[PDB]
Every structure is written in structure tokens, then in C-alpha cells.
Amino acid sequence: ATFLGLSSKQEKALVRLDKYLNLGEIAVSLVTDSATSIKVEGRQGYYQVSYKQPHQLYRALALLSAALRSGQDEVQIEEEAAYEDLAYMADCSRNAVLNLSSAKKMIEVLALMGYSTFELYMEDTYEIENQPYFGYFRGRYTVAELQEIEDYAADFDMSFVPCIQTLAHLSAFVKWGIKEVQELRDVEDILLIGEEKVYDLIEGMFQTMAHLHTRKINIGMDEAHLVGLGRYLIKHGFQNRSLLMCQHLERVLDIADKYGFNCQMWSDMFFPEETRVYLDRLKERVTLVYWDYYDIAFAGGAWKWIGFTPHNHFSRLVAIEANKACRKNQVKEVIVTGWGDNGGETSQFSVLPALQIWAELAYRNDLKKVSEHFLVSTGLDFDDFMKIDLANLLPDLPDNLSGINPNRYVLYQDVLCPLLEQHIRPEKDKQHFASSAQQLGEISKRAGEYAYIFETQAQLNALLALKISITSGIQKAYRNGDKEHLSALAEKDFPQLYQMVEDFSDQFSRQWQQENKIFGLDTIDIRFGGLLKRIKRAQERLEQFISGQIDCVEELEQEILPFNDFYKDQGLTATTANQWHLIATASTIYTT
Amino acid sequence: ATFLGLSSKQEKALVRLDKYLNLGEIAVSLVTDSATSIKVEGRQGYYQVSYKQPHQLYRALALLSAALRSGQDEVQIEEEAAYEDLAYMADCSRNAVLNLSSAKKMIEVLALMGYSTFELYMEDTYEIENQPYFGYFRGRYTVAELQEIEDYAADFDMSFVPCIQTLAHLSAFVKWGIKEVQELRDVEDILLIGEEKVYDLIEGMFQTMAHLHTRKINIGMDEAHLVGLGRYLIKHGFQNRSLLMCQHLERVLDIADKYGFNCQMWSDMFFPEETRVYLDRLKERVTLVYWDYYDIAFAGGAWKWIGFTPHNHFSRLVAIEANKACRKNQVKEVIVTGWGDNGGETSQFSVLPALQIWAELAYRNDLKKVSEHFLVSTGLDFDDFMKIDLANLLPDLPDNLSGINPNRYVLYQDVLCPLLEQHIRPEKDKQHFASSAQQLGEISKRAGEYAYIFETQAQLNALLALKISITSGIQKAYRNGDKEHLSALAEKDFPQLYQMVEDFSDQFSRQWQQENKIFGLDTIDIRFGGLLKRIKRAQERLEQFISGQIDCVEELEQEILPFNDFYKDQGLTATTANQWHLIATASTIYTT
Ligand SMILES: [Hg+2]
Ligand SMILES: [Hg+2]
Ligand SMILES: [Hg+2]
Ligand SMILES: [Hg+2]
Ligand SMILES: [Hg+2]
Ligand SMILES: [Hg+2]
Ligand SMILES: [Hg+2]
Ligand SMILES: [Hg+2]
Ligand SMILES: [Hg+2]
Numbered sequence A, B: 001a002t003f004l005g006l007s008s009k010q011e012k013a014l015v016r017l018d019k020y021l022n023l024g025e026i027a028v029s030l031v032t033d034s035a036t037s038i039k040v041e042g043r044q045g046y047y048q049v050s051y052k053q054p055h056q057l058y059r060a061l062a063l064l065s066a067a068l069r070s071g072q073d074e075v076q077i078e079e080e081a082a083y084e085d086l087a088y089m090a091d092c093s094r095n096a097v098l099n100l101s102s103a104k105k106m107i108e109v110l111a112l113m114g115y116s117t118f119e120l121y122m123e124d125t126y127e128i129e130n131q132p133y134f135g136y137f138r139g140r141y142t143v144a145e146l147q148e149i150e151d152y153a154a155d156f157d158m159s160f161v162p163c164i165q166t167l168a169h170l171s172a173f174v175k176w177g178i179k180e181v182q183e184l185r186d187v188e189d190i191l192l193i194g195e196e197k198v199y200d201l202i203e204g205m206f207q208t209m210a211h212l213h214t215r216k217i218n219i220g221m222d223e224a225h226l227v228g229l230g231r232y233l234i235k236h237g238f239q240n241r242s243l244l245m246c247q248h249l250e251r252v253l254d255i256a257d258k259y260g261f262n263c264q265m266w267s268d269m270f271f272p273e274e275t276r277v278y279l280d281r282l283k284e285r286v287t288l289v290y291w292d293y294y295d296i297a298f299a300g301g302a303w304k305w306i307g308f309t310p311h312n313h314f315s316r317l318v319a320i321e322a323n324k325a326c327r328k329n330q331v332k333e334v335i336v337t338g339w340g341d342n343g344g345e346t347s348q349f350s351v352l353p354a355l356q357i358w359a360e361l362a363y364r365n366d367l368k369k370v371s372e373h374f375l376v377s378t379g380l381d382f383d384d385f386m387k388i389d390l391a392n393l394l395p396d397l398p399d400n401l402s403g404i405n406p407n408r409y410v411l412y413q414d415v416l417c418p419l420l421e422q423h424i425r426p427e428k429d430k431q432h433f434a435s436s437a438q439q440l441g442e443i444s445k446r447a448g449e450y451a452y453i454f455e456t457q458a459q460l461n462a463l464l465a466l467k468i469s470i471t472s473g474i475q476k477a478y479r480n481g482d483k484e485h486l487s488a489l490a491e492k493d494f495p496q497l498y499q500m501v502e503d504f505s506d507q508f509s510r511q512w513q514q515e516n517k518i519f520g521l522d523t524i525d526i527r528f529g530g531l532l533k534r535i536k537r538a539q540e541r542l543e544q545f546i547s548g549q550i551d552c553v554e555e556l557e558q559e560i561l562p563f564n565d566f567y568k569d570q571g572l573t574a575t576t577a578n579q580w581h582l583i584a585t586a587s588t589i590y591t592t
């Protein structure tokens, strides 16, 4: 395709986007026009594209590309976006730090979908001068790295917003047993309000970020129960948390003003006479984000924080209702969040379908074109990609319940002491995982550049089917005194499970290294390594029982109880279990 | 030996103690006499033994046995013990639950040393009716088990005291995501003061213990910072912790009175007008224990809570000074504590030397006979046994600093990302571990029934020497670009280290199963498994660097910082690091 009206910047962007767009030998002319967000009109090889914001050029061209692919000659497309800003925020704080190459790829995909803004969630994963422990061995971003990511987004006329923490959720930093860190602490993951060394740290934070072009930052500042209740209380006595939050936020905003920043934060804080007055003054100096995944921006969820497998389906359900509500309430700004809770085990690209869904709702208020446009963004079929969710999609789950994550807890639970066993239907769930493995093995064959993430999932599902088979088989066979069936498992199925887990670690490690810096993979080595050792223990214990070397396997004599009652009121068998250390063992492991 | 004056009970005890005592063909007559704790007098095969308390018969006979072994014919021994009660408390709450056979062996050894009382520290590791999650998958003791242990001690005229928790330090119980448990919580490891369901639980505790003969119990009740600051504060607003502690303790003592129990607790609490008055009333209803390991009982330390290797040497140093001070202040009761912090990795029998030390100080006020008497108790040489400490006994450490535990952190630290590296002297420490391995290999050959614990230590020390060699070798070789030296390590030393770690897990597992119930070993499988997987990663990463498949190993490019500054003021290189999850990785692992 050839163009008239391009800037040199747009020329370079189109060189980068060429592999995605298949515009062919057509002629395109560009107009800037704020009558509508996007307009595409033309026929017989000559098209005019108009956009309101420059970044919207790239979605307009995706719509053109899709329309032509559909075999249209005549094109007449018009879109008025509901939101002035549409952002995607990746988590780089949960062990998985997006590598620069992956950040670039994501920026390109977001450009094509219509996002205006890229955000990174960094608790401690950016360098601060004079704070060598901050992000120590975490793969923290250098200033040069953050600049490179920012500048790459700016090349597509996209904005960049760092999402940091200025009070709480700094657990990876505050663990260091060095005075210059411990003196910054209130309690648990919370910094000490009123400590000048804490305000020194926070100025360091802004000094790092002042090296970027952006002057928009998310400072966190959500409310935590224990704020003011640790070393603060010892220092100062008890104080109204609202009052402390007010003290702290003013200090932070004064630092931010010094570096020219505009601050966004969670609304919580703003849900005694003189503190109410303080509150009303501060609210005017900040933008608020209202979160819900299940002068106000809305934060929606792209579900990739529940283990190894995302929930694009659930994301779609809530996106549809959230979009209605945001429109009703004239919301100007939406941030789609890609959290990574408790180890960052889910692919950074696992939620491309959810991302396209939100783009479509924002621009068209429907999903009528989601497949066609997703094909431009990814080169793949949307329904294929949506099957990435399968390890969570147990047959007959209610579709409106969140967090149900058997992908993770079936994997990590013990074999001899299976804490989640009563939440598993051993035939029904096993057959689902077995079938899912087959479906994903086929998709991976046609997934191209994304095949690697489908391979991980195919292997997980096959691993889960066999793990349930062996685990539930042992419980039955042991209860019924069937040493013959136990010997068979020990001889054939155990070595097969062990090998499958090893192969799964090798595949996951390929996925991780493709997407993330190497830092953080180590926690997963530990978890996989522990699982392997426990599988081996299970085999060994059974062998000793079969051979008569022990008279019973005490693990298998224990009554198993429900793991939690989170979905007891809804009557589910499956559940949500999303902390590895509570899934893997009933013993102490972190505690003293 | 033949006896006059024995009860049938004493007859049975002497049958059990026969393998330890080598009295030969002598004649012994027994007298009860409170003029002194113990008296042994006689010659030419005829001896008279007098004791004040019945249990002291067994130490008296140990002293006789030792005196005869020394080739004495004429014996004239007299001892006046400084303390009316001398107790040993084993930890059964840190993952390692002493099995019944080991409890019996320990009781026999304590009898011979002169202890009056055996205690078990059980946070959640005893069954409570109607609380199925309490001790769930922990190897909690049944009532029948606690009875069997109590009765075995009573057979030697020894008392039994359960040491439980009635407010805090219930972390393994409160983690269960079930309403009937979560409703019992204040915050972290702390039960909810003022919740009637909490008082129901505590009555369950006493109901279990009321099945024993003993009516002496330790209820814990130490002070915790966050008492009253979690769900309590939400329910009730802020309260003076002293006042809450006072409210709670009265309730507990009222329950205890109902079941006939006398309660001991930590003194902390007793370090507004009307609360001071409450305090003074409650103090009269309880016995207090004053702790220091570094109407008042003293709790001394037998150091076995710092990893895989004890510190009998440090225990001796503090025992000597603590004994002086307890005598000066007319203390009537001493409890030697065998804590198991953070996984119970140290042998339950690792501290027999410390135990004999305290017995000797209590009965003789010196250690002049420690070897001779220890030979009766264990069948082994005291100085041999003291070398069990070697993995902690780095040359030139100051002998008065506690917790220095390179046995644990050299083992668990990463290879690619060694967080404790600056606290290691790679030649000096490695040579110490190498030599220690040799010394312990020789001792194990002559250790008899205890050989297994020396084998564990010999293997640990050899493992540590090689792990330092490889780890520091990689840091040097990588910094100096020496891919040849890296290839050598990958080819020879890595497989050797991996095998040594596997063999060490197999040996530790034999030690564990000898001493403990199977529950808890699983956390150690996880830790060992993770270490194995990280060793494999290290090899793999180096291989890819050597072969040119990657251009750098980013892990090895990081500046290493000190791990902590705990002993910075004293100028040490070694340190104390005693939480596995902070040693093994800088990444998040328990956090969300
Ligand atoms: Hg954000
Ligand atoms: Hg304020
Ligand atoms: Hg506030
Ligand atoms: Hg919305
Ligand atoms: Hg909304
Ligand atoms: Hg058994
Ligand atoms: Hg105790
Ligand atoms: Hg009171
Ligand atoms: Hg008190």
C-alpha cells in the first residue's frame, strides 16, 4: 500500500506494523478530523482514513485491513470511542518482568487494537539511585530500559504510565535485613508514614521516573488495614488511619509537584472534622481509579493472575457489563489490568483475546467484529485463542464465578497428601483435561509465533489428567487395600508423571525466557523442584508399603477435609486456591 | 546387680535402663532421705543409694555406674541439686513431631541425667474434639499417644507438662480458609480475644489435656505486638493491649480452673489504674517463666533451632552463666528448651551434650564429671558428640555470638544468585567444612545407635565444602571470563554436587523417619527438591553461555550485596540467616 499524508513517524510505525497489516496494492490518504474517533471510506483501491487521535491511525488501518480481507471493496466504517483513554497495565512485580522485546511486541499489538496507553506495574522493579536493595536480584528496569519502552510506545503515539507504590505492597523490598531498609518499615509490606527516610525513598522514586517524558504516574496509595499499626504505633501511638493516609499523601503529592507529575491513585482513601477538610483538598490534586474485576477512571480485569492459565472467558463476561456501566456513568478513562499474583506463572500474551474485547467494546460497543480484528492483531483465530483458558473451564461451572483455578491447584497439590482432593471430580475433571490437551495440541500446530503458549497449555492439561488419575487412584486403591493396583501405578504411571512434569518445566521455562527477564524464574524452579521431589516420595512410600517394609502409609490414612469454603454458598465442588505455599503442604514452610 | 528396697515400678525401670547401666555383680540397697538429693556410698560390691525424689534414683545409679567404670571400688558421692524441677521441652510444632519410640528413648536418657520433667511444645499438634482442622495433616498427637508418653515418663517418676498456645503462635491452624477457623482470628498467627468461639476452642484444648494425669500446663500467653490490632480493632476499636491480655488470660484461667489445671506462662505480660489492679490479681493465679537463651522459672536454651546442625558449644557457654544467675536468685525451676524454628531440620537427639551439661550444673555446679556421666547416658564420648556442632563452628568466630548458622544458609543459598556469598570466606570456610566432614566420618564409625546423626553431619559438611567451591568458583571464573574453568565445573563438579545433595536428602530422610512422624518431612522434600532444580538450572545456564547460545548470564552480572547487617557492629563476615524462603531466593515466593 502507498500513502499520502503520513508523517515520518507514521512511516516508521507502518514499517513495523507491515507484517500485521495486509493492505496490498491500495492507496490510502490520511485526514485528521475530530468529528469521530475513526473513519474509513473508499473503494476500488483508494481509501481515506481519518482519526481524531494520532494513535488511532493504527486501529483505523486494522479495520481497513480486516474489511479488505473480508473481500470488501467498498468500505464505509465509522467509530466513536467511548473513552478518551484506553490503557493496558502489565504486572512486572509478581516475579515476571516483561523483557524489552516482549514489551515492544505488546505495544505493537495494543496500537493495532486501539489502546492509547501502555502501563507497567512496578512495586520494586525499577532502579532508584542510592537504594541498591530496591529491586535487588528482581530484574529491575534501568532508566535506559524504561526510556526504551516509553519511546517505543511514543513511536505509535501511545502514552506511558508507570504504576508504582508509595505506601504499601513493597514486600520484596522490605524483606532485606539491613538498617537502611528496616528503618523504612511500619509493618508487613507497608512503609513508615512520617519517616523522613521514607520521603527520601519516595523522592528517589520520582527522580527515576522524571527521566521519562511522561508526567502521568499511578502512585497506588490504596488503604491497608495495618497502616499505622506497626512501628508507627510504637513511635506515635494510635492514629486515625484516614488522618495518616492524609498526612502521607500530601507529602507524596508535594514531592510529585516538585518533579512536575500528575498523580493517579486508588479511590479507597476517599470513600474528625479537620481530616475531612484535608481529604477534600487532596482529592482535587489527584485522579482516582475505581477497581472492579469481578474525575474517576475504571480499572477492568484481564484475568491472568490465577496460575498458569488465564480466564479470557470470565474477562469477556465482566467486560461486557463493565463497559455498559462505564458508558452510563460517562467514564473517560479505562485501564485493563494484567495482574500476575503469586509468581507470574501465566503468559504475558495469554490475554490478547480479553484485550481485543475491551478495544472492541470501547470503540464499537459490541463484539461483532472481534474475530476479524483479532486476526489482524495476532494472525490467529479468536476462538482458537480463547481455548487457551481450557485448564480452568471445567464442565458445568457457573460462568459468573471468578478465580476458579484448577489449572494451578491440581498441579501443585501433593500426591500422598492431596489437600484439594475433595474439590476434584476424578472422572469428569480428568476427561476434561485430557480432551483439552488434544484440542490445544491441534491449535498449537497452527498458532505460529504464539504456538509456544498453546504448547505449555496442551502439556499442562495432559499432566493434570494423569496427576488426577494417579492421585485419586492411590486414594481408592489404598482404601480398598489393593496393593496390586498400587504396584502398577508405582511401576508405570509414576515415572510417566515425573517425566511429564520435567517436560512441563522445560516448556514453561521456554515460555518464560521468551517473555520475561530471567529473574523470578527461580521461584518456579523451586516449586517445580519441590513437586518433583514429592512425586518421588509418593512412589517411594508406596513401594515400601507394597514390599512390606512399612505396615501402612500414614499420609493415606488421614481423613481429607475440604480445602476452603469460598464457594460453599454457591454449592460448587471446584474452588479458588491461589497461594502455592498453602496448596503444596499443610506443614509450615515460611513461618518460624 | 541385685537390689533391696526396690518398688515393682523401680524394678521395671531398671530393666529398661539395664543396657545403659553396667552395674555388674554388685549389691545395692536403697534409702529415701531428703538430707541431700543424692547419696552413693559403699565398697567391695556393696553400695547404698539414697535419693530425695524417686526419679533421682536413676541419676544416682548413673553416678554409681560411672564411678565403678572409673575403676573405683570405694564410692562416696553426694549431690544437692540447685533446682526442685529440671525439665526438658522438645518442640513438636515446627514440622517435626517426635515419634513415640523416640520420646521413650529421650525419657530414658533424661531419667539417667536427672531431669524431673519432660515437656512437649505443641501449638496445633494435638487433637481437639470438634476441631478437625486443628493439627490437620500435621501428625497431631492423639490422646492415647500423649497418655503413652506421659505414662512412660511416670514409670521413671518423671512428670509431664504439655506446652500449648492459648493466644498466639497458631500459624499452622489459622491458615485454613474455612469460616469456623477464620472467625477465630485477630490477625496473622493470633486468636481473637473476646470471641466466645475462641473460648470454646480453648476449652477443647483443656478437655484434651484433662485426659492426662498431669494438672500442670504451660499456656504460652506471651505478648504479641499485633494483639488487638486486626479483626479485634475492627470489632471493638483500639484497646490497651495490657487490658486485652488481662481480659483473655482471666478467661483462660477460668477454663483451666474448671479442669483442675495449674498454669505456667511467659512473664512478658507482667513486666490504666484498674488494669494494673487486674494484673496483680492474675499474677497470683499463675507461674511465670523467664526466657533467655542468649514464683519464676528460668527457660534456658539447648540450641537446635538454627538449621540442620545444633550449637551445643554455645549452649554450654550460656548454661554456665545462667546456672550462676539462677542460683544467686534462688530459682526453683529450670526448663531447657529444644526449639525447632522454621522446619525442624535438626536431630531431636542432637543436643544430648547440652542436656547433660545442664543436669551436671544443676546437680554438681560444675562439669567435672560431664564425660563420665554422659558415657552412661549415651554410650559415647562427650567430646566426640560435641563435634556434632562442626558445620556451625567456623574458625575464629567469637564464641559468645548466637545463631551463626552457616550449616543452613550455605546449603540453601542459590548457586547462580548466591545471596549469602559475601558472608562466606571461600577458602577458609571450605577447608573447615572439608576437615569437619572427615572428623565426623570417623566419629560415625564408633557412634553406635547415634551414628545416623553423625552421618548426616559428615555428609552436610562435605556437601558444603563442594558447594562453596563451585559457587565461588563460578563467581571468579565468570568475572574473569574464564569459560574453560566454567566448562570443567559444569562437566565434573555439578553432577557430583547434585548427587551429594540427593544422597544428603536420602540420609536426612532416614534421620527424620527414625525420630519423627512422617508429617512435616514434606516441607523438606520441597526445599531439597527446589535446591536440586536450581543446581540443574545453574549447570544449564552455564552450558548455554559456554556454548555461545547466550551472550551473558545475567544472574552472574549482578552486584552481590551483604545479606543482612545483624553482626555488622561486631565486625563479623559470617552471619545468622534462619528463614529458608529469604535464603533461597530474592523473588517473591509466599507473597501474592
Ligand atoms: Hg495503574
Ligand atoms: Hg492531611
Ligand atoms: Hg485519605
Ligand atoms: Hg468500563
Ligand atoms: Hg465500569
Ligand atoms: Hg502404620
Ligand atoms: Hg514450656
Ligand atoms: Hg482483666
Ligand atoms: Hg497482662
Ligand SMILES: [Hg+2]
Residues within 6 Å of the ligand: B298, B300, B322, B323, B324, B325, B326, B327, B331, B334
Ligand atoms: Hg538457670
Ligand SMILES: [Hg+2]
Residues within 6 Å of the ligand: B298, B322, B323, B325, B326, B327, B331
Ligand atoms: Hg538463670
Ligand SMILES: [Hg+2]
Residues within 6 Å of the ligand: B551, B552, B553, B554
Ligand atoms: Hg546478555
